[PDB]
Amino acid sequence: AGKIPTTTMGGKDFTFKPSTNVSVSYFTTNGATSTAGTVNTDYAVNTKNSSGNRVFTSTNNTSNIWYIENDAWKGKAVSDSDVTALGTGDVGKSDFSGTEWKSQ
Amino acid sequence: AGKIPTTTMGGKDFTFKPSTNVSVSYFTTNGATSTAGTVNTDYAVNTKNSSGNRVFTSTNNTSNIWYIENDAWKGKAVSDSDVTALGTGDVGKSDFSGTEWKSQ
Amino acid sequence: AGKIPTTTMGGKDFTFKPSTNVSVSYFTTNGATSTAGTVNTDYAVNTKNSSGNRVFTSTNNTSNIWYIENDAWKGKAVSDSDVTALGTGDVGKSDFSGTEWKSQ
Amino acid sequence: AGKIPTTTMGGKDFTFKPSTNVSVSYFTTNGATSTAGTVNTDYAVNTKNSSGNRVFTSTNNTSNIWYIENDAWKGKAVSDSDVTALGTGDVGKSDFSGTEWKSQ
Amino acid sequence: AGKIPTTTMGGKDFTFKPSTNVSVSYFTTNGATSTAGTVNTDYAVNTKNSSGNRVFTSTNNTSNIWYIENDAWKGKAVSDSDVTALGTGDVGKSDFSGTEWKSQ
Amino acid sequence: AGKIPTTTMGGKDFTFKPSTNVSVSYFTTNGATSTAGTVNTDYAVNTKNSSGNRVFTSTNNTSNIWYIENDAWKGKAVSDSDVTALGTGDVGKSDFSGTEWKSQ
Amino acid sequence: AGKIPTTTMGGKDFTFKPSTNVSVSYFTTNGATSTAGTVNTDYAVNTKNSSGNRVFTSTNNTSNIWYIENDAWKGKAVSDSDVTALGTGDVGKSDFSGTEWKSQ
Amino acid sequence: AGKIPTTTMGGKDFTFKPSTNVSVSYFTTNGATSTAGTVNTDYAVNTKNSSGNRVFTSTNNTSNIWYIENDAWKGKAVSDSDVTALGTGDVGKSDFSGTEWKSQ
Amino acid sequence: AGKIPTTTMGGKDFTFKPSTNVSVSYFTTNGATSTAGTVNTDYAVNTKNSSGNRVFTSTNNTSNIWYIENDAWKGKAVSDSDVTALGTGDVGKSDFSGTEWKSQ
Amino acid sequence: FTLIELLIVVAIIGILAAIAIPQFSAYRVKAYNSAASSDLRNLKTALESAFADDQTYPPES
Amino acid sequence: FTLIELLIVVAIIGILAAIAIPQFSAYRVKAYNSAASSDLRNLKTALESAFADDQTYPPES
Amino acid sequence: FTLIELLIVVAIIGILAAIAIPQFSAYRVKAYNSAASSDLRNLKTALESAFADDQTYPPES
DSSP, X not given: OOSOOSBOTTSOXXXXXXXXXXXXXXXXXXXXXXXXXXXXXXXXXXXXXXXXXXXEEEETTOOSOEEOOOSSOSSOOTTSSTTOOOOSSOOOOOOOOSSOBOOO | OOSOOSXXXXXXXXXXXXXXXXXXXXXXXXXXXXXXXXXXOOEEEEEEEXXXXXXXXXXXXXXXXXXXXXXXXXXXXXXXSTTOOOOSSOXXXXXXXXXXXXXX | OOSOOSBOTTSOBOOOXXXXXXXXXXXXXXXXXXXXXXXOOOEEEXXXXXXXXXXXXXXXXXXXXXXXOOSSOSSOOTTSSTTOOOOSSOOOOOOOOSSOBOOO | OOSXXXXXTTSOBOOOOOOTTEEEEEEETTTTOOOSSOOXXXXXXXXXXXXXXXXXXXXXXXXXXXXXXXXXXXXXXXXXXXXXXXXXXXXXXXXXXXXXXXXX | OOSOOSBOTTSOBOOOXXXXXXXXXXXXXXXXXXXXXXXXXXXXXEEEETTOSOEEEEETTOOSOEEOOOSSOSSOOTTSSTTOXXXXXXXXXXXXXXXXXOOO | OXXXXXXXXXXXXXXXOOOTTEEEXXXXXXXXXXXXXXXXXXXXEEEEETTOSOEEEXXXXXXXXXXXXXXXXXXXXXXXXXXXXXXXXOOOOOOOOSSOBOOO | OOSOOSBOTTSOBOOOOOOTTEEXXXXXXXXXXXXXXXXXXXXXXXXXXXXXXXXXXXETTOOSOEEOOOSSOSSOOTXXXXXOOOOSSOOOOOOOOSSOBOOO | OOSOOSXXXXXXXXXXXXOTTEEEEEEETXXXXXXSSOOOOOEEEEEEETTOSOEEEEETTOOSOEEOOOSSXXXXXXXXXXXXXXXXXXXXXXXXXXXXXXXX | OOSOOSBOTXXXXXXXXXXXXXXXXXXXXXXXXXXXXXXXXXXXXXXXXXXXXXXXEEETTOOSOEEOOOSSOSSOOTTSSXXXXXXXXXXXXXXXXXXXXXXX | OOTTHHHHHHHHHTTTTOSOOOOOSXXXXXXXXXXXXXXXXXXXXXXXXXHHHHSSBOOOO | XXXXXXXXXXXXXXXXXXXXXXXXXXXXXXXXXXXXHHHHHHXXXXXXXXXXXHSSBOOOO | OOTXXXXXXXXXXXXXXXXXXXXXXXXXXXXXHHHHHHHHHHHHHXXXXXXXXXXXXXXXX
């Protein structure tokens, strides 16, 4: 669960590979379940360079790319718990109150 | 008054958020008045990056995006008076005489 | 003569303005003559970006948009003679023999 | 035989030209025979973009546009045999069993 | 029971097939009973795109096409109970009080 | 008074409902008076889409549908005074001098 | 065969020249054959600085730039056999098992 | 004529000043003529350190920086004739035969 | 006022410390005022080794590093008045007339 | 990638952001109009059907 | 090229990677809806054609 | 400038030269397809217009 999709539900390869040293984590409504009759209406997805102090994230029904920029973690991947990523659930999050920010 | 609409008159969310550092100002015939029986036939809308030397604008009954490009203001938002924005009124402006220009 | 129409014969504004840097030339059976009793059954119309190596054209009784793509002219507008535009006359041109082409 | 009609039996031009890079093949009961006394009650017609992985087809007594979408052929036109087009005959085909599909 | 008719009582094929991804449900006075001596004086019929937030419906003795537009269901077909369709019975419904609406 | 009839004098329902967003106004010799012994020999009737720049009208003893097409009103219904509708009286108007027109 | 293209099939110059001291080798489906009717759907291309210990390569249907970094060869060009380049054939290689790598 | 541009045709300052002891010479299609309606499609530009044995040059439609490296001149600037610079004309020079070189 | 910045307005440490024996003086539009809402568009900055006969300086909108090289002062720092430094104000100085020089 | 590459993109994004979006106002008001004239020409058949039942046009409302 | 050049690129790549990508969900659901209402208004003509052949609407299924 | 400065640039040029360029092949074949299906749905209106003139679909070629 929780990793970049290798294939879309129509059986076609997802035609995108990540950069040399970037961790990615991806979450959707119905997990890994390629049951040929489901519809994931949403996604929540995040990336960090293993060596970067920023984790970047977006969801289905949002404009912008939202970051956190905690100088603390610098050698982690988004699989680690202490990164404050957007896990399974909270997948739409059309709004953000006080946690992450990209606006002014 | 005068800011990007958060909701359309049918009660649905306006489904658009601006870029990381762009000021926006928006004007229409009947202001903020969500009276569930009015019809705004028109809009006038403008944007500038806080750090940019250009303010861009459009109105309902015009093609093109019209700019001014005054090198003077570089750290202003379109809320400021000294930006020569298209305020409330002059909301259609299907024609432009000698102030702003995008044509040749 | 020969420019984009600003108004249709019913007195209404032509509701279309060209892009920032595109030249347009337009020709019809009865020229500019807004005599309130004529019928232009046809048009021939062409466009080029001032900085583009392509002039594009269409006429009333044709599908497709027909180009020429001469690398020679790159800083001309369709007002210039050396562009091989579709002038007044030859306004229908439902067929093309060996001059311009968009088909395979 | 087998190509888009240039003229209808009443002697009038067929008033339709295909897109820039699309192959078309068309079949009817009585072929090319413009004998001024026949009646083609039916047609079967198909299109593919030369560069597309889809061939699309319809017949006289069917709703929908039926495709195949074989990723194999990508640089063919519908003149080629290995496209599984609807040739002469099978011109009505009001029903489809297991070959092509547009329904759910 | 409850699906689009494939044949009318005179034995002729119903000559209409639905769009690529639309669910349809159809109800009449005497069900599926092709007894060659009955008369269905009425019908009630509804459609929804599987992926749409609207179900549309009409009956025999009504003008207009009446919708509901519940944003909740988005991946259902009109076979599902939680769509508020017009089932068997209530087949004329020449009037509507407070449930569905297309008027102003 | 002045609205589309819901029932004819023989007690039967008027079997016609207007379109989704169209205003209608209807006038006859003896108003709403369903006295079971009167005869309305005439009617005058008009329609406009709430959002349209045209009001259309007809009367009993006229062919054609007569319009006005004033671009001014665009968000009115025919109940409004400033629409120049055919009110009570002038119900036949077999002829028109200089106000409304559908002829050449 | 096997070198950087000097011209594309539309007869236009390939508008790119390599760096001062870099070897390049390029392979495609139909070789050098400029037959004005073929379609190379793919390429495989590699580069090395004559003095570098790295050969870099990419193909049509892959993201990333894949290297090998063998310290052994340091004065070779990619024309040499003992460089483990991506020759003619294996031109897509959308996946890599255990030979070259750019991922983590 | 023939020196580094101090201003571009849009009236803005050229925002670049040369190094402490480097001569520069620059040539374009229409010379110094800031006529507010011309288009220089090309440039040819060269530099030498007053004390260096190398003159370096580039043109509009070329990759690489091309040198000559004549040990003879060591105290000249590119204004001098005996430097074999790229003067007015020969401004594109997309190709080089046997005079200057940066390739292998 | 007037010394090397220890912190940038985003609260991050300026990550640069001067050499063992060099005096530095730095000036900007809005002084020391870290008000979390201002924008210094410019700087003027100068350095001298305490024991050197040269003071070196640069500003925001200039290439080159401009010196004076007065043999007189040899044991001063740029805090001293008799060094002819670029103080507060004259902070852009995109041009220099006759005071300091690095060009030929 | 290179600063010059990031100078063509901004030179194209500026182009593809102004392509003369047309006024789609007249092309929609015509549909609203032709709904109302259709609706009237239909309404007339109901009136002149109802007359040939009752010898009278309907009462208003 | 120079470290400062590689500091503007990363300062622009960050800009051009966040340009407020809009929610293209409502603008597609409207198309799916207007396929179904079109399809129904067409289906009605088949029903009320078939009635005027047989004096009955069709049997279901 | 300094050898260490020329060691970060080469450490960044290597980064900004591999940013996972995506496969822009499926996103273009969809356009070529939707030209042909549009073209067919248009071609059908010409055929079924010409029938309602002549009581026949056109002869081929």
